[PDB]
C-alpha cells in the first residue's frame, strides 16, 4: 500500500558468512534498487548506473555521454556551486568517481557513515536538474581532451579502437567513445551546434528512470534506507525509453577471414585471434563461454599454452569470452610472441585449431562443469567483504541483468549443465570465422593505413583460402590433453578456535639470527584463509646493476618454470607473489589455508634447487630487455616519479644502467649467482589468518629448514641489515632535474616539498595540511585552471622521510605548472586564515574517519601490518595514537607549519622539482597571483647531486 514502490523482492540470497542485510525493490518510476544495511560500516556508499553509454552517442558528436558524465559533477539547480558535491564529500571523508562504457554510465561515492543523506541528496540532483553551466562546459572539455591525450600513445587503447575501426563502419560499435576537444567543441562549433542544448537534450532523452539502477549502503535499517531512497529518487521522470539492442554483429561476412598487421608504440610482439559469437549473457546459469574459456585458456599439463611455450613460440595466453554489447560478443585467444613465434603465426594458429578440435572429439565434460561449479560455490561462500564504494558501483551495473533475488549470486553460482550450448559455441570457433591481428615493430613502414583517432599504422589482408583450408583440416595432436582433476581444490574449511593468547596486533613470536616472525591469528573475519608474507634480505640482490638483473631473471625463470604446477593452485584460490626488491626477495602466499603449506614448500624447494632451462633463459632475458627499453613509452608523469625516486634514494640503479649491464648476464654467471644469493639471508615474515601459533612457527621453520638443507643458507649480521636513506635537502634550497619524454606529447612534473622524518607530530601536520588542500588543489589546478587530466597532491613517504608533492601531466610547460602550484599554495594559506573554526574541525574529523576506517578483509589488515614491518616502524597501534594527537591541533599549529616548511620564503623550505618535457617542447624558461621564484639549481648529474648532500637518519623502530 505504498504508491511509490512498485514491488519488494523476496529474500536476496547472500553468503551465510555475509553479516550485512539486503532488500531489493523496484520504484514506481521503474528504478531497480538494492539496499544494504551494515550497522558496523565506517563509510557509507551509493551508486547509480544508467543503462546508456557511448554506443548511444549522436553520430555527429563523438564522446557526448562521456562528456555528459564529466558535467554532472559540476552543478545542479538545487546545488549550483560548481564543486559543492566534490567539496561536501571531501570534508566528510568521502570520494567519488564515474565511468562510461558503451552501454553504461556508472556514478558512485562513499562518505562518512553519518552523512549519507547529505551526500545522497547532492548525488540525486545529477539525475534531476544538472546545470550544464556554459563556462563549466568550456573548461571541462579540456579535461576530456587531456584524458584522451593520455591514451593516444597507449598500445591497449589503440588496439581497442582499431578493433572498432575494422568492423562495419555503419555499426554503433565503430564509434569513438572518449571524445576530445575536436569532437566536443571545435567541430560542433563549425557545425552550429549548441552543446549545452545537446547535453540537456541527451540527458532528457536517456536519463530516464526506467534505465536506472541504484544501490545504497549505510548503517540505517532497511526501512530507513527504503524511505530515504523513495524520498530522493521517485521524482526521477520515467521517459519510458526502449533499451538499446544490437542484434547485428559488427563483424559481418567481409570482416571475417581478415589479417591485420599493426605497428605498436612499445616494442611488443602480440597475436590476437578473434571469433564473433552471439550474446551468451542470457545463458548465465550454464555459462558455455566460461567452460571453454577455462579450457582453451588453461595453463597446466597438456594445455594449449603449454605446447606453444615448449616450442618456444609464446610465453602467455589469454582465452575465453569477451563482452560486446546486448546482441553480440567475442571469443578471443591472444598470446605474446617470442622472436621465433613471430615467424610461426600460421603454426601457432593451427595448434590453436588442433586444440579446439580435441575439444570437439572429446565433447562436453560434466566433471569439468562440476569443478567450475564447486570452485564458484566456495568462492561465493567465503568471498571477502568488499569496500562499500566498489561494491555498490558493481551491484548497480548487474542490477540491469539479474532478478533482484539473484544479484549477489548470479556472477558466481552455476546451475545448469548444457552440453548443447558448449557444442554450439564451439561450432563457431572455426577458421572460416577467424580474425587475426599481429602486433610487431617489424611492420614499420610496411603499412598502408591509419586509424583516424589514434593514428595507428596498420595493413589489412585477406587470409589466403589455402591457409584457411590448412587450419580446417587440423588433425588431433597428441600433445594436447584435457586437464585432470584439480588436486588443489580445498576441502577443509574449519575455523580454528581463538587461542587463549591471541593478541589484537601481530606478536613477535620468534627473533633469531636467521629469522624474525610476526604472527596474528585472525580475530575478525573468520574465513578459512591465510596470508603468509616473507621478506628475504640479501646484500647481493642489489649490490650492483648486474646483480639486480640476475635477481630479477632468477625470479622470472622460477615463476615461469613453476607456472604449470601453480595454475591449479590459482583456480583453487591459492596464489603467490614472488619478486626481487632492492633488499632481496619478496614472497607472498595468499588464499585458502587448507593446501597452503604444500604450495609454499614447493616454492622454497624450487628456488633452493633451481635448475635453469637454457631456452627459457634466452626468451625471458630478451623479453626483459624490451621491458627495460619500453620504459621510454610510459606516461610523462610516471617518468617524473621515476626520476624523483632515483634522485632521493641513497642507492638506485637507472633503467639505462640496468639494460647496459644486462648484456653481461650469461647462463654460467646466473647459475653461480643463485647459490651465492641464497647462501646468506635474514627473513622477516608476517603470518596472519586462520592459523595457530604452532602452525606458524612450523611454517616459518619449514621455510628455513628447506633453505639450510638445499642451499646451506646461514644468517646475516645485524649490522649488515642495510636500509637505504633519503637525501637531505638544504634550507631555502630548490633543485630541478629536467628530462624529455620522447613518445608523449604532454609534459609531466613532480614537485616535492620535503619536510622532516616521520613521527607522530610531523605526520599529522603533513596529513592535515594535505586533507585541507586536497580538494581545493584538484578544483583549482584542474576544474578551474584546466592544467590537465592528471592532477594530484598529498603526502610523499619514503625511507622514513616525508613531504608534500604535486603531480601534474599537462600540455602547458613545466615552468608554467610550477608557477601555478606556487600561486595555489598562497591561495591555500589565505584560505586557512579565512576559514571558520568549524570548517577546520570538520577537516580534522574527515582525516580521523579516514585513518580509523577498519579493514573489511584479511588482505587489507595484513597490508597495514606489513607496512609497519617493512618500514621497520612496527607501529601497529599507530592509528589511535596519531588520531589522538590530531585532535589537539589548531589553525595556529597548521599556519605555523606552512610558514616554517612550505611557504615560498619559508626558513626551512626544501624543494625538488622533476620536469619532464613533452616530445615537441625544446627549451624550459583571470588567474590568481603567482609569487616570484628563486633561481633553481639545475641538477646536472644524479651521483654528484647526491654526493654533495647529507643523508637523513633512519627511523627509530617503535
Amino acid at each position: 500500500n505504498n504508491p511509490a514502490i512498485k514491488r519488494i523482492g523476496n529474500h536476496i540470497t547472500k553468503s551465510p558468512e555475509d553479516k550485512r542485510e539486503y532488500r531489493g525493490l523496484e520504484l514506481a518510476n521503474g528504478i531497480k534498487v538494492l539496499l544494504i544495511s551494515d550497522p558496523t560500516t565506517d563509510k557509507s556508499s551509493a551508486a547509480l548506473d544508467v543503462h546508456i553509454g557511448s554506443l548511444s552517442d549522436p553520430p555527429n558528436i563523438a564522446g557526448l555521454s562521456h562528456f555528459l558524465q564529466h558535467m554532472l559533477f559540476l552543478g545542479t539547480k538545487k546545488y549550483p556551486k560548481e564543486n559543492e558535491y566534490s567539496q561536501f564529500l571531501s570534508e566528510h571523508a568521502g570520494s567519488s568517481n564515474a565511468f562510461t562504457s558503451g552501454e553504461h554510465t556508472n556514478y558512485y561515492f562513499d562518505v562518512s557513515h553519518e552523512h549519507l543523506e547529505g551526500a545522497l541528496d547532492r548525488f540525486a540532483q545529477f539525475f534531476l536538474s544538472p546545470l550544464f553551466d556554459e563556462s563549466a562546459k568550456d573548461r571541462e572539455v579540456n579535461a576530456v581532451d587531456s584524458e584522451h591525450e593520455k591514451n593516444v600513445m597507449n598500445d591497449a587503447w589503440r588496439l581497442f579502437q582499431l578493433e572498432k575501426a575494422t568492423g562495419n563502419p555503419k555499426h554503433p560499435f565503430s564509434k569513438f567513445g572518449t571524445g576530445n576537444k575536436y569532437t566536443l567543441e571545435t567541430r560542433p562549433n563549425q557545425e552550429g551546434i549548441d552543446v549545452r542544448q545537446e547535453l540537456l537534450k541527451f540527458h532528457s532523452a536517456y536519463y530516464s528512470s526506467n534505465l536506472m539502477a541504484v544501490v545504497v549502503l549505510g548503517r540505517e535499517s532497511l526501512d530507513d534506507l527504503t524511505n530515504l531512497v523513495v524520498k530522493l529518487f521517485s521524482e526521477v521522470e520515467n521517459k519510458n525509453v526502449p533499451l538499446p539492442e544490437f542484434p547485428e554483429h559488427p563483424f559481418q561476412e567481409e570482416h571475417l577471414k581478415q589479417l591485420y598487421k599493426i605497428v605498436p608504440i612499445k616494442d611488443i610482439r602480440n597475436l590476437y585471434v578473434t571469433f564473433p559469437i552471439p550474446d551468451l549473457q542470457k545463458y548465465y546459469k550454464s555459462n558455455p563461454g566460461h567452460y571453454l574459456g577455462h579450457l582453451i585458456g588453461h595453463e597446466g599439463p597438456g594445455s594449449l599454452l603449454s605446447e606453444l611455450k615448449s616450442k618456444g613460440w609464446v610465453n602467455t595466453l589469454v582465452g575465453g569470452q569477451k563482452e560486446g554489447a546486448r546482441g553480440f560478443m567475442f571469443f578471443i585467444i591472444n598470446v605474446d610472441l617470442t622472436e621465433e613465434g613471430l615467424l610461426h603465426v600460421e603454426d601457432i594458429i593451427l595448434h590453436m585449431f588442433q586444440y579446439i578440435q580435441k575439444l570437439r572429439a572429446e565433447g562436453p565434460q560434466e566433471w569439468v562443469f562440476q569443478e567450475l561449479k564447486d570452485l564458484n560455490a566456495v568462492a561465493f561462500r567465503f568471498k571477502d567483504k568488499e569496500r562499500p564504494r566498489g561494491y555498490t558501483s558493481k551491484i548497480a551495473g548487474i542490477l540491469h541483468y539479474y532478478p533482484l533475488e539473484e544479484v549477489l549470486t548470479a556472477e558466481y553460482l552455476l546451475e545448469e549443465f548444457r552440453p548443447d550450448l558448449i557444442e554450439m559455441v564451439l561450432d563457431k570457433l572455426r577458421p572460416e570465422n577467424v580474425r587475426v591481428a599481429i602486433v610487431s615493430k617489424s611492420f614499420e613502414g610496411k603499412t598502408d593505413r591509419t586509424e583516424e583517432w589514434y593514428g595507428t599504422q596498420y595493413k589489412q589482408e585477406a587470409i589466403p583460402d589455402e591457409v584457411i583450408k590448412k587450419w580446417q583440416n587440423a588433425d588431433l595432436n597428441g600433445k594436447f590433453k584435457l586437464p585432470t582433476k584439480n588436486e588443489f581444490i580445498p576441502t577443509n574449511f574449519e575455523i580454528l578456535p581463538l587461542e587463549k593468547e591471541a593478541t589484537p596486533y601481530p606478536a613477535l613470536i620468534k627473533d633469531t639470527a636467521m629469522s624474525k616472525l610476526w604472527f596474528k591469528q585472525d580475530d575478525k573475519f573468520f574465513l578459512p584463509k591465510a596470508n603468509l608474507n616473507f621478506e628475504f634480505f640479501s646484500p647481493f640482490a642489489y649490490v650492483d646493476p648486474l646483480h639486480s638483473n640476475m635477481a630479477y631473471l632468477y625470479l622470472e625463470l622460477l615463476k615461469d618454470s613453476l607456472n604449470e604446477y601453480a595454475y591449479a593452485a590459482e583456480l583453487a584460490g591459492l596464489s603467490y607473489d614472488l619478486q626481487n626488491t632492492i633488499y632481496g626477495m619478496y614472497l607472498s602466499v595468499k588464499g585458502y589455508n587448507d593446501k597452503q603449506p604444500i604450495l609454499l614448500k614447493k616454492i622454497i624447494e624450487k628456488m633452493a634447487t633451481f635448475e635453469i632451462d637454457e631456452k627459457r633463459f634466452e626468451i625471458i632475458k630478451e623479453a626483459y630487455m624490451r621491458s627495460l627499453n619500453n620504459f621510454r613509452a610510459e606516461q610523462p608523469h610516471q617518468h617524473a616519479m621515476y626520476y624523483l625516486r632515483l634522485l632521493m634514494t641513497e642507492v638506485a640503479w637507472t633503467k639505462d644502467e640496468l639494460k647496459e649491464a644486462l648484456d653481461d648476464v650469461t647462463l654460467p654467471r646466473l647459475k653461480a649467482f643463485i647459490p651465492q644469493l641464497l647462501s646468506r639471508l635474514h627473513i622477516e615474515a608476517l603470518l596472519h589468518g586462520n592459523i595457530t601459533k604452532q602452525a606458524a612457527l612450523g611454517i616459518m621453520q619449514m621455510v628455513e629448514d628447506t633453505l639450510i638443507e638445499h642451499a646451506h643458507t646461514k644468517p646475516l649480521l645485524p649490522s649488515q641489515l642495510v636500509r637505504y636513506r633519503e637525501v637531505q635537502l638544504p634550507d631555502r634550497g630548490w633543485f630541478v632535474y629536467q628530462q624529455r619524454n620522447e613518445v608523449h606529447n604532454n609534459s609531466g612534473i613532480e614537485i616535492y616539498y620535503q619536510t622532516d622524518m616521520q613521527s607522530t607530530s610531523e605526520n599529522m601536520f603533513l596529513e592535515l595540511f594535505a586533507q585541507i588542500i586536497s580538494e581545493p588543489a584538484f578544483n583549482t589546478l584542474r576544474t578551474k585552471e584546466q592544467l590537465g587530466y592528471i592532477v594530484f597532491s598529498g603526502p610523499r613517504r619514503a625511507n622514513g622521510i616525508q613531504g608534500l608533492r604535486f603531480i601534474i601531466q599537462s600540455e602547458k610547460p613545466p615552468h608554467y605548472l610550477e608557477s601555478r602550484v606556487e600561486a595555489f599554495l598562497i591561495t591555500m594559506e589565505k584560505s586557512i586564515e579565512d576559514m571558520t573554526e568549524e570548517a577546520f574541525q570538520k577537516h580534522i574529523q574527515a582525516l580521523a574517519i579516514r585513518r580509523l576506517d577498519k579493514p573489511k578483509k584479511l588482505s587489507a589488515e595484513s597490508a597495514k601490518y606489513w607496512g609497519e614491518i617493512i618500514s621497520q616502524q612496527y607501529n601497529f597501534d599507530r592509528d589511535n595514537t596519531e588520531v589522538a594527537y590530531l585532535k589537539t591541533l589548531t589553525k595556529e599549529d597548521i599556519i605555523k607549519f606552512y610558514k616554517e616548511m612550505l611557504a615560498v620564503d619559508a626558513p626551512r623550505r626544501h624543494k625538488v622539482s622533476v620536469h619532464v618535457l613533452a616530445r615537441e617542447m625544446d627549451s624550459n624558461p583571470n588567474l590568481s597571483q603567482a609569487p616570484a621564484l628563486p633561481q633553481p639549481e639545475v641538477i646536472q648529474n644524479m651521483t654528484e647531486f647526491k654526493r654533495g648532500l647529507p643523508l637523513f637518519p633512519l627511523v627509530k623502530p617503535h
Binding site: 558524465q69 568517481n97 564515474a98 565511468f99 562510461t100 584524458e147 585458456g297 582465452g319 569477451k322
Partner: peptide, 7 residues
C-alpha cells in the same frame, strides 16, 4: 581465464 572512461 577472462575498456571504460574514468572521471
Amino acid at each position: 581465464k577472462c575498456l571504460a572512461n574514468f572521471l
